């Protein structure tokens, strides 16, 4: 997250870190056994880390649970990043509490102008490189479909939306991939892609989660 703030320990209790010897992506806990992330975060050997603030220090609220299975969306295209969504099942159910909690799926899509919370352990620099170890947060509005498409000619599908600031300065970044965009207590987006970070007229692009609720529910119901 570039131009954000330190969230505070366990203030984003649905935020997970995906770890394969190191943090490589964010995710969102949606029930005791399932995490939603980006399809471009897919790999084998995933451990899901819940209750994290400092990802380099065991602070006492963590739960480390290995993934038993991953399910990339059937229509995911890695070239265009269309349908950039994946489900990860935990080998055991997480113990839910005030600091490890599921985030509700949307019942309807959120509109341009809706204020949301984007969070992650990604790069905090738009030019250089600096990885924070504590969770960073950004309050950002959803942008209009028209402004999103104008920012990225030929690249915005019906399964994507832009959020952030056309002036730049505040954005998601490398390492935030797969993490949450939460608006009015609902998971509306997944950190998916952008062109650099916090650049003028290049806001972050997010997977439009409301399009996938039926797939998420049906997949969970049979796996």
CA-to-CA dists, residue 196 to 1, 30, 59, 141, 221, angstroms: 12, 29, 32, 19, 38
Contact 59, 135 (CB under 8 A): no
Instruction: Compute the least distance from the CB of residue 54 to Ca ion, in Å.
Output: 5
Residue 52 CA to residue 32 CA, distance in Å, equals 16
Which stretch, 52-60, 87-95, 121-129, 130-138, contacts Ca ion (CB under 5 A)?
A: 52-60
Residue 108 CA to residue 207 CA, distance in Å, equals 14
Is 40 a known active-site residue? yes
Q: By C-beta, is 58 or 221 nearer to Ca ion?
A: 58
190-219 mask for Ca ion (x: CB under 5 A)? ------------------------------
Angle in degrees, CA 207, 56, 44, rounded to 5: 50
Give the active site residue among 53, 84, 176, 192.
84
Is 177 a known active-site residue? yes
The verdict on whether residue 62 carries a ligand-binding annotation is yes
Q: By C-beta, is 55 or 148 nearer to Ca ion?
A: 55
Give the active site residue among 40, 53, 70, 176.
40
The verdict on whether residue 181 carries a ligand-binding annotation is no
The verdict on whether residue 57 carries a ligand-binding annotation is yes
Q: By C-beta, is 99 or 208 nearer to Ca ion?
A: 99
Residues annotated within a binding site: 52, 54, 57, 62, 171-172, 174-175, 177
Query: Which positions lie near Ca ion, rule CB under 5 A?
Result: 52, 54, 59
Residues annotated catalytic, as ranges: 40, 84, 177
């Amino acid at each position: 997250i570039v131009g954000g703030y330190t969230c505070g320990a366990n203030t984003v209790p649905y935020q997970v870190s995906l770890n394969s010897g190191y943090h490589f992506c964010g995710g969102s806990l949606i029930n005791s056994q399932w995490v939603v992330s980006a399809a471009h975060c897919y790999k084998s050997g995933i451990q899901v880390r819940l209750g994290e603030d400092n990802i380099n220090v065991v602070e006492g609220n963590e739960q480390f649970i290995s993934a038993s299975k991953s399910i990339v969306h059937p229509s995911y295209n890695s070239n265009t990043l269309n349908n950039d969504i994946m489900l990860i099942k935990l080998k055991s159910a997480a113990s839910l509490n005030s600091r490890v909690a599921s985030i509700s799926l949307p019942t309807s899509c959120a509109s341009a102008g809706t204020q949301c919370l984007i969070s992650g352990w990604g790069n905090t620099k738009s030019s250089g490189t600096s990885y924070p170890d504590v969770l960073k947060c950004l309050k950002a509005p959803i942008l209009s479909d028209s402004s999103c498409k104008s920012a990225y000619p030929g690249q915005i599908t019906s399964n994507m939306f832009c959020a952030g600031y056309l002036e730049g300065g505040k954005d998601s970044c490398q390492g935030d991939s797969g993490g949450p965009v939460v608006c009015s207590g609902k998971l509306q987006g997944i950190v998916s892609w952008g062109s650099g970070c916090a650049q003028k007229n290049k806001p972050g692009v997010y997977t439009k989660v409301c399009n996938y609720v039926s797939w998420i529910k049906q997949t969970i119901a049979s796996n």
